[PDB]
Amino acid sequence: SGSMIEYIIGALGLIIASVQDEIEDYIWIFLAVFGVLFAIYSSITLLDYSILINSISGFVICFILGYMMFLSGIGGGDGKMLIGLGALVPKFQMPIYTSLGTLLNLNYVPTFPIMVFINGIFFMVFLPFVILFRNILNGARPKTGKEFILMFFGEKMKVNVAKEQKRLIMGQNDKINFFPADEDFSKYSNNEEIWVTPQIPLIIPITLSYLVTPIIGDRILDFLI
Template sequence: MFDWIILAIVLVWLTFAAICDIKTKEVPDWLSYSLILLGLSIYSLKSIQENSFSPILKSLTVLGIFFAISELMYLSKQWGGGDSKILMGLGAILPEYPAQLINVFNPNLSLPFPIILFMNILIAGGVYGILVSLTLILKNIKKFTKHFRELTKEKNIKSIRLIILILSFLFIILALIIKNYSLQLAFFALAIVPLTFLYLYLSVKSIENISMYKLIDTKKLVDGDWIAEDIIINNKLVYSKKSLGVTKKQIEVIQKHKKKVLVKDGIAFIPAFLIGTIISILLGNFIF
């Protein structure tokens, strides 16, 4: 019974969070905190039912692990605060695959379920991110092309590209000389991958600059927004663009002195959490 309740809660909460993220680029804190609370409550009841500390310890352990991962992703600016809190909620409520669903979906559980869940979220996020990026490029193709060309003309990019091209040429020669098939593949990969990543990086930077920065009214600022410029008021640095997000106290000060600020608007990532979780429940580890 608990397992079906868990599945229903996870799907409803993630669906609502995804809708909020797409519409407002913000996930309400109550969604994340209630998911954590529900997870801990359900596994506490499981512990009482089974007369064992094992269920609640599993929930707390995976919650702790996902908290550490969330902090790392947040501090490296890969995720926003809402994404991090939702992952913690998933850790609390899905520390293991719901046993009653195994015979229903017959998933591949060759790895511990938290690893499968996190891995599938990242894979879904990668595919989702590429699709969103392609959509943004097509919507802003002229601006994208112009900015991309400007980036390729920058002196440091030219130098990096020249070094990569020289190394790629050398790796191709080595691949043609060496007769070992495995080494040939390795050298061809070394010749192609760095150049591919360089152009991928330039594409991402171009997308960021043409579609992810916007000037907004300071009244619309919310806790955690990434302001893309230093805010100096009365010769005092109120906010640094290197910060992890603006705080409520900083917002109050900024609103008194500024009408508009430039903010970085990231991609809504919670839909990838929903997709990754559904894949994990239906298929488990579908990679290997």
């Protein structure tokens, strides 16, 4: 309940961010700045050096965790918006039910921004299953080997619609490259069926996570341990 006005602004940033899909660069930096500036105002106003400290700290702890996630190559992307969210909304109303939670929850530690990510990553684990159905409902069945694997991670449509939506060619039948990105690598095929990369941006699960975490908190970590 405390830091409400703040929370509402991160939510905006992420919904703009989750929807759009370059501007991902302007948003992250804006969140940090408004956040830091905002803390100054609240601090002097509320008269609590308490506020400012978590903020700066939050920005820092997050820079390190993502820069490391950046470096330990995995993170690849987004670690950045978790960064900015950090120096603004670290710490927000939220239930804890784990030993780790008592830890993630502390003085400087940006609890919510961090939590929003963890709960966010598990969500991404539903994705392949989301696409499994999108594909079922799309009236697509698999005829070959890699297709089954594909059924979970890719979406099948006609080269007409393929080019129409101008997507990344993933492969035909078993000629699948599960990591394609020669641009639209010569879409040279008949107006037939093809496999392509979907655009389900990990940004979403994190935004869903942003909104649900305040209600969920540590529960998922609990059940999964």
